Subunit: 304 residues, 4 copies
C-alpha cells in the first residue's frame, strides 16, 4: 500500500473551552482550554489514523503552540514532518455553550509563512516518494502567494506525487490550476466559488463537478453535500452517496474525516463508489473526527 502525506500550510493549536452562556459584551468566563490539533491536512492525517491507516502530517510549526500541536499528534501516533516557522502556531477557539448545547468555532488564519519556510515545506513535500499521496488540505496562511501553492502542486506532481486537494476560495483555484489533481473535495460553496457561479439548479453541482473532470483539472471531484452526502465524479462515473437517515449531532471534522477515508481508498485503488461511500461513512461518522467502528457501520449500510 502507498504512503500518505498531508500538508497543512495553516495549522493551528485549537482551544476547546466551555462557558455556561453566550451573550455579547460581558466577559464570558471560559474553562481552561483543552488543546486540539487544528488544520485540514493535520485532521485528515488524524482521521486516517482513526481509520487504521497512517499518514504523515507535514506542516509549519512555530513556538510553544507549534510544539504542543506536534506533541498532541505524537500522542495520537500521527507521524509528523514539521518546518520550524518564525511566527507561532495560531490558535482557533472552540467554545461549547452549556445552556444551549451549541458549539461556536472561531476560525482565524494560520500563522504567517515567510517565503523561506514555504520552500522548506516544498522541500519536505518533494522528499515524498513517487506514487505516494499528498493531501493538501486547509486554508492558505498569510504570506503565501497563490502561485506558490500552484508551484508546489506542479512540483509535487512532476515527481509522481498524487495530490488530493481540499481547500477554498482563491487557494482552491490555485491548487487546481496546473490540473491533473488526483482528487478534489469541494463542499457546495467551495465548488460554487471555484467554478465561479451560484449552483441553484438541480444538476448544477454534477455539471460543475463534471466540468472540472472534463477540463482535466482533477481526475476525481467529490462534491460533499453535508447531510446529503457527496457526489463523486470520474471521467467514467458519476455517483451520489447519501448517508443513512441518522443524527447528526455535530459537523466538526466532517470534511477532513471524509477526505482521510477517501484518501485511504485512493491509496487502496478503490473504485469511485467505494471511495465516496467510505468518504461519506467517515464524514458522517464524524458527525455523531470519525471513529473506525462508526465509519465501518455506516459503510456497511451504504454497501449493503
Amino acid at each position: 500500500m502507498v504512503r500518505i502525506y498531508t500538508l497543512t500550510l495553516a495549522p493551528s493549536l485549537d482551544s476547546a473551552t466551555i462557558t455556561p452562556q453566550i451573550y455579547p459584551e460581558g466577559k464570558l468566563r471560559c474553562t481552561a482550554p483543552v488543546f486540539e490539533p487544528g488544520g485540514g491536512g493535520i485532521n485528515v492525517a488524524r482521521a486516517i489514523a482513526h481509520l487504521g491507516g497512517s499518514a504523515t502530517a507535514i506542516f509549519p510549526a512555530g513556538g510553544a503552540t507549534g510544539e504542543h500541536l506536534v506533541s498532541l499528534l505524537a500522542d495520537e501516533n500521527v507521524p509528523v514532518a514539521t518546518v520550524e516557522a518564525k511566527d507561532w502556531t495560531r490558535q482557533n477557539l472552540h467554545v461549547h455553550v452549556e445552556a444551549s448545547g451549541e458549539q461556536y468555532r472561531f476560525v482565524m488564519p494560520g500563522a504567517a509563512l515567510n517565503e523561506d519556510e514555504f520552500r522548506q515545506l516544498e522541500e519536505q513535500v518533494l522528499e515524498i516518494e513517487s506514487g505516494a499521496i499528498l493531501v493538501i488540505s486547509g486554508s492558505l496562511p498569510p504570506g503565501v502567494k497563490l502561485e506558490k501553492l500552484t508551484q508546489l502542486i506542479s512540483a509535487a506532481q512532476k515527481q509522481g506525487i498524487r495530490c488530493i486537494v481540499d481547500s477554498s476560495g482563491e487557494a482552491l483555484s490555485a491548487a487546481l490550476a496546473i490540473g491533473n489533481i488526483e482528487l478534489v473535495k469541494p463542499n457546495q460553496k467551495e465548488l460554487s466559488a471555484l467554478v465561479n457561479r451560484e449552483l441553484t439548479q438541480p444538476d448544477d453541482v454534477r455539471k460543475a463537478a463534471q466540468e472540472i473532470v472534463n477540463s482535466g483539472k482533477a481526475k476525481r471531484v467529490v462534491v460533499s453535500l453535508g447531510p446529503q452526502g457527496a457526489l463523486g465524479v470520474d471521467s467514467e462515473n458519476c455517483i451520489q452517496v447519501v448517508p443513512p437517515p441518522v443524527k447528526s449531532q455535530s459537523t466538526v471534522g466532517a470534511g477532513d474525516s471524509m477526505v482521510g477515508a477517501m484518501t485511504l481508498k485512493l491509496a487502496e485503488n478503490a473504485s469511485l463508489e467505494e471511495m465516496v461511500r467510505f468518504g461519506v461513512a467517515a464524514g458522517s461518522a464524524a458527525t455523531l473526527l470519525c471513529s473506525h467502528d462508526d465509519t465501518q457501520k455506516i459503510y456497511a449500510y451504504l454497501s449493503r
Copy 2:
C-alpha cells in the same frame, strides 16, 4: 383525481415581521406584520393550490384574525370550509432579522375549540364523499380530547374518507391508533416519538417506518428527513429520495408542501416512488425561498423532473 380536503384543528393567522437585530431585554422594533395563513392542513391545501390542484381547507376560524385567515385563503384561490369559533384565531410570529438574514418562528397553540365547534368540524368532515381524501395536519388545539380526533378519523374512514395524517406527539399517536391511515409523514423526531425510541442506527428509520405499516397503523409511511429527502415505506417498498444538491435558504413550509404534493400523487394513484419524489420535490421547492410561499409549481416540477 378525487376531491381533496384538509383539516386544521389549530390554524393561525401568522404575523411575519422584520426587525434589524435580535437581542434580549430591549424592545425589538418590528415592522407592521404581513399576515400569513398558518396551520398544517391550511398550508397543505395552499401547497396543493400552488401545484395546480385543489384542496378544501376545513378549519375553525374565530374573530377578525379568523376572517383575515379566510381572506388570505380566498386571495390564494384556496377553497375553504370554516366553522366559526368563539376563541379568536391565534397568531404565531415569524421574525426576520435583517442583520443576520435569520428567521425566527414563535409557535404558540391554536385557539381553543368548544365541543360544539369540534362537532361542526366533524360534520364538515363527514360531508366529504367516500373515496375523497382528507389530510389531517397540524397540532391538536386546546379544548379537544385526543379521543375526539381518533373518533373523527374512525368516522371519516367508516364512510370511505381516505385519511392522510401529519402531526406530532399524542395527536399523531392518537391519529395512528385507529390505523388504516393512508399516509403519514412524520419527520425524524416525530417518527422517533411515535415509535418511542431513538433512531441512531442506519436502518432505524426504515425499520420504524416498516413497523408502523406492518402494524396496520398506516398503509404508507413517508419519513421526511429534512435535507436528506424522505424515506417512503409501503408493505412492498422502501424508497429514499434525496433532494438535488441545491442549498436550501429556508425550511418554512417544507413539510406541508411535501404533504400537499404526496396527497396529490396519492389522489392520482402514483407509485410510492412517484409520490415520495413529488413530496421531496415540493418540500425542497419550499426551501428555495424565505417567507411562506411554500413550493411553487415550477420549482417542484423542475426538482421532480430531476429526481425522475
Copy 3:
C-alpha cells in the same frame, strides 16, 4: 386631588410566552401565552393603580383582542374609556427563553386608527375636565397623521387639560410642537432624536432638556437615563436622581412606571425633586411594573 387620564393611541394585547431555547430557523415551541395589557398610556394607568392612585386609560380597542385588553384592565380595576376601532387590537410578543433566562420583546405597531376613530378618541380626551392630567404615552399607530397628534394636544391644553407626553420619533416632536407640555419624559435616545443631535458630551442631556424648557415646549423635562436614573429640568431647577445601587433584573415597564409615579406627583403638585425621585423609585422598582412597596422603599432611600 386631580383626575388622571392616559391616552394610548397604539395599545396592544401582548402575549407572554415561554420557550426553552432561542435559535433561528426552527419552530420555537412556545407555551400558551399569558395575555398582558400593552401600550404606554395603558401601562402608565396600571402603574398608577399599583401606586395607590387611579387613572382612566383612554384607548382604541378592536375585536376580541381589544375586548381582552379591556377585560384585563377591568380585572386590574383600571378605569377605561375606549373607542371601538375597526382594526383589531394588535399583539406584541414577549418570549421568555428558559435556558438563558432572557426575555425577548417583539414590538409591532398598534392596530391602524382611521380618521373617524381618532376624532372619537379626541372627543373622549376633550371630555376630560379642566385641570385634569392626560398622559399621552406610546407610539403613534398607523393611520394617524403627526399633525393630528399636535392637534389633539393643542385641543386638550386649550381646555386646561394638563398634558404629559411620553413618546418617540416624529410623534414626540409632534406632541411637543404646540408647546406648553406639562411634562415630557424622553429617554436618552428619544431626547437625542427630539433635539436632533447625538448627545455625546457630559452636559448634552442637561442642555437639551433645558433648551426644551427654555423654548417653552415643556414646563418640565425628565430625561430618563435607565440605570442612571433621570435628570429633571424646570424653569427653576435641574436635578439628577439616580436609583440605589441595586439589581436590575428586567427593564420592562420601567418608563411607564416612572411616568405613572411622576404623574401622581404632578397631580399632587409635588416639587420637581419629589416628582423625579418618585419617578426614579417607580421606574427602578419596575426593574426588580412597579409595586407600591418596592417604590416606597426606593423612594425612602432617595429621600433619606
Copy 4:
C-alpha cells in the same frame, strides 16, 4: 507622586478579531487578529500611561505571545518588569460581530506559574521601595496557591508597599484577608461574593463596603457600579459618583481604567471624592469606544471636569 507598579499574575495576549455573523456550529471565519494586552494589572498600567502617569507592569511572560505582550506594552511606553515563564502567555479572544456591532469576550485562565516563577515575581514586587504603590489586579493563574498571594501582599506591606487590589472570588477574599489594603475596587458582583450575600436593598452596597473598611480589610472600598458610577467608602466618607448621561458603547477596560485613575489619585493624595470622581471619569471614558483603548486622557479630563 510616588512610584506605581501593577502586578498581573495572569496576563494574556488577547486576539481581537472580526467576523460578519455569530451563530453556532459553523466555522466563523475571523479576521487576522489584532493583539491586545490582557490582564488587570497590565491594563491598569496602560490606563495610567494614558492618563499621563507611569506605572510599571510586573507580570510573567512566556513564549512569543509573552514577547508580543511585552512588545505591545513597549509601543505604549508602559514600563515593564517581566519574569520569563515556562508556560506560554495565554490568549483570550475578543470577537467583534460586524452584522450586530456586538463584541464577545472569551476569557480563559492565564498560563500556569511555577513556584520559581512566582518567587521571581515576588521578588520583583519586593524590590519596590517603601511608600510606592502596587496594584494587584486580575485573576489568580493556575499553579499559584491562594496563600502565596496573601504571603506576597503581607511581605509587600511589611516593607511599606501600598497595595491596591482588584480581583474576584477567592483571590480577592485572600488579598483582603491580610487587611490594610489601601484600596479595593470590587464591582457589585465581586462585593456580593466577597461579603457573601446578595445586595438587594438600597443601602446594601454601602453597608457591605463599610463592613470591609470597618473590618480593616481595606482602608478604601470603591464599589464600581457599571453605568451607576461608583460608591467610594472610607472610614469617614461614603460618596457615590455617577457618570454623566453619555451612553456607553463598550465596557471593555472600564474597571482597569477606573483603577488606574484612582491609583493616580491615591498616589496624589486626593480626597476620596476626587479619587472616585477620577475613577468614574476614566472608567466611563473607557466605555466611549469599542476595542481596548481604555480611557483617553482627554475623555477622562472632560468627564472629571463635569463631575467636578
